[PDB]
């Protein structure tokens, strides 16, 4: 009847006695919920409410040991505070008089890892007491997903469906002060208050409906099930692509019946949680990218820093612009290796390493800080994703600011060049690095209708071999030669191999014993060992192989290539050539969208800038007068003249649909725009968009895809021959 | 001869042999910086030069135990890398001859951490080997501090005050592309080997300078010397009020002024900087109540200027990016949300508005939401109180060539006194209540009247218990509590800073264990407090003339003893009255009221002006006086200058003021086409003829005037805020 002992807990008055069928326990994610429970409770609703904050998350009894079991808190606790008891079963329904609480209402966030809590609650409850869930015993309390005000009226939406269609309606267009509840601590005391007074709107009902609901508990959960698990992805995703192939809405999208199925639950929204880790650790196949490291990108892009930034600030504007949500130590992590340039990292850094980002000697762990490290898009980096192609993307949103795309989409397959490393749920990714400019001749080859050469991994800027040795898998070796009679020479270490690594894994433990002594002579970029044995220790290691003596071999495997395509469902790739056939048949689909793309804005920019320039040569001229004449006066001129309304922002308009007459595109125009050069300058602009029309229309998507490969060509001659001029 | 099972050790070739004196030990800030040697060395300087890379800092040997100095793993590396032995002492120069180095060369940063490093390398030599410190065994890697490029040609500067002049030079004004080479990893592989290959400009030599020197290192690290630290940074600070009031220039740049430098030199002018950074940034500025951390946030919400609320997550991005906080996520924010609470016992003017849960009275703040779903916003008396116009009169500060946020704020108030000020700082610490908003701007008009100003009683907004006198800077923060009937009694009040969770576990909780209570109930929101407890009637007899608030530990003391702050010179002084915070505060603020009607009635009539030609070519173009149509840009610049029509006006006053190719139109020309129709014309006028009256009425006005005014719109708003606070509870 009272509880004794446990601090956290605002238990009910009326709970542990007669009467405690009608009370309930709100379990809350942490501190800050409970405060906004204790919000909405008031003083009035304390008799039949309790509250108990969860410290994390509940433990995973399914694949728990026992005295892991009876030793954890949480659980002793809640058992404690509800009336639980293990040597019951509570299968007949008036045995839930003998607990202090008729009802567990479990409230979370409204996102993944509050799915994940109320998962291991149910979880929890389901592996001692499954009768429970057949009682109505567990309930979710869930706020609106989204508010909108109308006219000073604020509307609360307990849907994204339900938001969508009453913004579509015309009367609900000029929407203002749109706001996403998904999290809890986004509304305040006073919407807190606001819920608990329309209790029953926000209460739902966790329903078992049969043996299917156990199934799906026990697949979410259970040790002994982790290859259903990957299955149980698998469709997830295929079953997504279908949908979003077919047009039709998903599954779930974090909204309200006031019954929800332990099955639907399971299947629809831990599931989302159950798949995160693989949709964050394994890269797009389109451009090689995880979501981390895109946000990192697009926010370079729109920034656009034709000077150099530190890599500190650069961090705070992909905070910032992106939304991104990992952490500042990820963050700066992301964006150093994105720079890294020494063999064995990116064969194309799409950022600037201006500093010490790292190096060969400790792989990249020696970098400086990012208060003192500066960087800036590589001159390469917009001749890979063209500036335009933008205009085709699908850019996400983070509630309610637009952020980066599912995916950019290169001139040529970014995921083969700078590889690919990603450990994910039930699937791991690696993939080996490849030369950019074969990639360019197969790509030209493929355009040709020609047969693509293979391609075999290729590490800029290292010297030794790479070979294949059967299966997907490659042998990769440093450099070793024989001097003297009592000197070796190593000078080049297998890829990935460092060198601090390999002194003290390798050469000194060979020193105390094959070798008498190793002296070093390495630059930040290149290695050389010069070792010295007796010659009977030499002629021995010449007999085993120099290169296996020395652990100058190391394997690479194309095994595991596996990655998003362009739908979000992972696949396995069986070769490089699988990767680069299904990335050419999209990326030359996005050049005749991007000449669509251009067509139409084109056309547009053409025909503004006509009425641009007709209405200077008309005002030159005093054809028409714009002194002392109204704004009303000034367009109804416009008008009979004939001048068209805002070309570019129609089309626009046009494009995103799939007052009156708009003039700001004439008559913002400085009043320099009548001088002389000035009235030169624009005619040259206008016949110049008149030409660039008929030249585009005179080429194919493939003509502006092999234009582009030339271009990026070009530059990356250009910077890649600057390099090593600044090496030596 | 050969070191053995030191992997992180790049050896000397030459070392330990010959030509051990000629050979020089690098020792790195970590490993970033030793990739930065070892790029520069190459092949031919792995002969006489060897790089070890420092993990962290070395001990201080100088405040150790003797096991913890022998079984220190950096430190016996260090010993056995150079040959140093404790038994030795090296007082004969000959006994270089044992060691497998002659010279130690330290490389860190150029920057506050660095200059620890630096630092504790020579306590840890001069504690062991004082004789060393004499025969120069010491040396230090410096890199220029600036590069600026003109012309295509990227020059190289080893001081401020060196790139300061080459920029007084006219021919040398387009400096280009400037960067700050503090840190190490700034620079290049390819500039590491730039300076590696003029190692000699780059060296810098530590020079024993005599028994002045020994008293510095002891001083800046002996155990036994706390107070005599204190002497030490209050001196330093009147040092810098001083230079700074003489125009002088600042002590030490962090950039080589000589091939020499002293011991001493060393721990007064850099190291002090260290020693003094933990004071730096806990203790706030008098004249507007912040710490360097909190006026970056502030100063990117007025930059930003948010109409609409943000994500907390997105403005902590927000100011990592613009103000360069440097004090990491979670420190940052931690900064925002603070500055957004508002409940009892927190800010009696929260700056920042709390859209979400901020955290509440039940846990001391302490149950904020995630900052990706929390929003915040300035509070539309984040303005009133700092106006933007002021923003022309302070001095911002910069973090290499970034501008960042000023030196401080100066608020129409006293901000240090409304939301209290905390912070432990090095031999010094900040409490100090918050004082009333209402009573300070009333006293604030007294002031400005001649008058004496009121005492001030701290007052907590929201608070519904006593604060009263206990004498000698004391005051008496005591609960509220009332006796229902003769077996229960109920606590409605709390004192301020005992927060609602912390009371039930640590006072009622023990309580029901010897033992008062045998039950209580609890009936708080998430803004008031309510416990009724039940007792034996004996029991309410002891407490009720015990003292029910002493009993239930409803009674804390409030201390004005600690009222620590930098004045507006950056120097800390100590304050015995909230009198005379007022007082400093106050005569500053007048002056900057006086500042800012000078600032104003130089822009007002620049823009008075400015109006007065736009207004004129308007009206001569409408009425056909003058023509652009088809006409030669220097056609049309000649009429305007023989017309007589004015170079951009504002632009003349902004370059004049900072001050202490030809004549500039675009002011005029850029303007719409619409700009020549009616309704813009009408507007136009309108504003011109506003402008004039603008000028006019200030010039009626004192800078007195001008604070009464803010004043006046500051109390109006806080009444509307203050009622929908109320009405939305």
Redesign the interface.
């Known amino acids: 009847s009272?509880i004794?002992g446990i601090?956290?807990l605002?238990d009910a008055?009326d709970a542990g006695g007669k009467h405690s069928l009608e009370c309930t326990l709100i379990l809350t994610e942490?501190?800050?919920?409970?405060?906004?429970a204790?919000?909405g409770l008031?003083?009035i609703g304390?008799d039949r409410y309790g509250v108990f904050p969860l410290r994390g998350k509940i433990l995973n009894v399914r694949e728990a040991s026992h005295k892991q079991i009876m030793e954890n808190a949480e659980i002793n606790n809640i058992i404690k505070i509800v009336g639980l008891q293990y040597k019951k079963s509570y299968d007949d329904a008036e045995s839930l008089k003998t607990l202090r609480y008729g009802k567990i209402m479990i409230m979370t966030?409204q996102d993944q890892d509050g799915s994940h809590i109320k998962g291991l609650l149910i979880n929890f409850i389901h592996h001692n007491w499954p009768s429970l869930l057949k009682h109505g015993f567990l309930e979710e309390f869930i706020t609106p997903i989204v508010k909108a005000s109308k006219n000073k009226q604020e509307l609360s939406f307990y849907s994204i469906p339900e938001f969508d269609e009453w913004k579509k309606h015309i009367e609900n267009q000029k929407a203002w002060k749109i706001?996403y509840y998904?999290?809890?601590?986004?509304?305040?005391?006073?919407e807190a208050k606001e819920y608990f007074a329309d209790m029953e709107r926000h209460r739902i009902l966790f329903r078992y409906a049969g043996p299917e609901d156990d199934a799906a508990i026990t697949l979410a959960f259970s040790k002994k099930k982790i290859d259903d698990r990957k299955e149980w992805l698998t469709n997830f995703m295929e079953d997504r692509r279908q949908r979003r192939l077919h047009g039709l809405p998903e599954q779930f999208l974090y909204g309200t019946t006031k019954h929800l199925t332990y099955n639907d639950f399971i299947n629809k929204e831990l599931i989302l949680f159950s798949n995160s880790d693989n949709e964050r650790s394994i890269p797009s196949l389109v451009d090689g990218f995880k979501p981390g490291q895109r946000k990192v990108l697009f926010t370079c892009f729109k920034r656009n820093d034709k000077?150099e930034v530190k890599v500190?600030?650069?961090?705070?504007?992909?905070?910032?612009?992106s939304?991104?949500?990992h952490?500042?130590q990820a963050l700066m992590m992301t964006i150093v290796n994105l720079a890294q340039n020494f063999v064995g990292s990116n064969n194309i850094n799409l950022l600037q390493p201006?500093?010490?980002f790292?190096?060969r000697?400790?792989g990249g762990?020696?970098?400086?800080?990012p208060?003192?490290?500066?960087t800036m898009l590589s001159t390469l980096a917009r001749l890979l994703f063209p500036a335009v192609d933008d205009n085709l993307l699908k850019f996400l949103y983070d509630?309610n600011?637009r952020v980066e795309p599912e995916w950019y989409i290169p001139i040529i397959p970014m995921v083969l060049i700078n590889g690919a490393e990603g450990i994910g749920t039930g699937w791991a990714c690696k993939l080996p690095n490849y030369d950019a400019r074969e990639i360019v001749n197969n790509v030209r080859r493929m355009l040709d209708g020609l047969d693509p050469h293979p391609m075999l991994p290729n590490y800029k800027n290292f010297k030794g071999t790479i070979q294949e040795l059967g299966q997907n898998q490659y042998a990769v070796s440093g450099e070793i030669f024989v001097v003297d009679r009592n000197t070796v020479e190593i000078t080049e270490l297998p890829v990935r191999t460092w060198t601090?690594v390999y002194?003290?894994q390798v050469l000194?433990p060979m020193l105390?014993a094959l070798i008498s002594?190793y002296?070093?002579?390495?630059?930040?970029?290149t290695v050389?060992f010069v070792v010295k044995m007796t010659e009977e220790k030499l002629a021995q290691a010449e007999a085993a192989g120099l290169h296996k003596v020395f652990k100058l071999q190391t394997t690479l495997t194309c095994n595991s290539m596996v990655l998003f395509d362009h739908m979000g469902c992972l696949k396995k790739y069986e070769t490089v050539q699988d990767i680069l056939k299904e990335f050419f048949d999209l990326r030359l689909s996005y050049y005749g969208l991007r000449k669509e793309w251009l067509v139409g804005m084109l056309g547009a920019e053409s025909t503004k800038l006509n009425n641009q320039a007709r209405f200077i040569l008309e005002?030159?001229q005093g054809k028409i007068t714009?002194?002392?004449?109204?704004?009303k006066d000034?367009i109804q001129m416009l008008v009979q003249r004939g001048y068209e309304s805002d070309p570019v922002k129609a089309w626009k308009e046009a494009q995103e649909k799939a007052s009156g007459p708009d003039f700001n595109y004439?008559?913002?125009?400085?009043?320099?725009?009548?001088?002389?050069?000035k009235?030169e300058e624009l005619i040259k602009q206008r016949d110049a968009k008149g030409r660039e029309v008929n030249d585009l229309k005179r080429k194919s998507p493939s003509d502006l895809w092999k234009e582009d490969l030339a271009a990026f060509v070009e530059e990356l001659d250009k910077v890649e021959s600057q390099e090593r001029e600044?090496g030596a």
């Open positions: 009272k004794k601090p956290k605002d008055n942490g501190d800050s919920a409970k405060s906004l204790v919000s008031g003083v304390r966030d706001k998904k999290g809890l601590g986004t509304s305040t005391a006073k000077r500190a600030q650069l961090a705070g504007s992909v905070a910032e612009m939304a991104y949500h952490g500042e201006i500093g010490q790292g190096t000697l400790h762990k020696d970098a400086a800080s208060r003192y490290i500066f509630d600011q601090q002194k003290e000194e105390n002594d002296k070093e002579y390495h630059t930040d970029t050389k005002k030159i714009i002194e002392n004449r109204s704004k000034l004439i008559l913002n125009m400085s009043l320099w725009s009548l001088t002389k050069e009235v600044d």
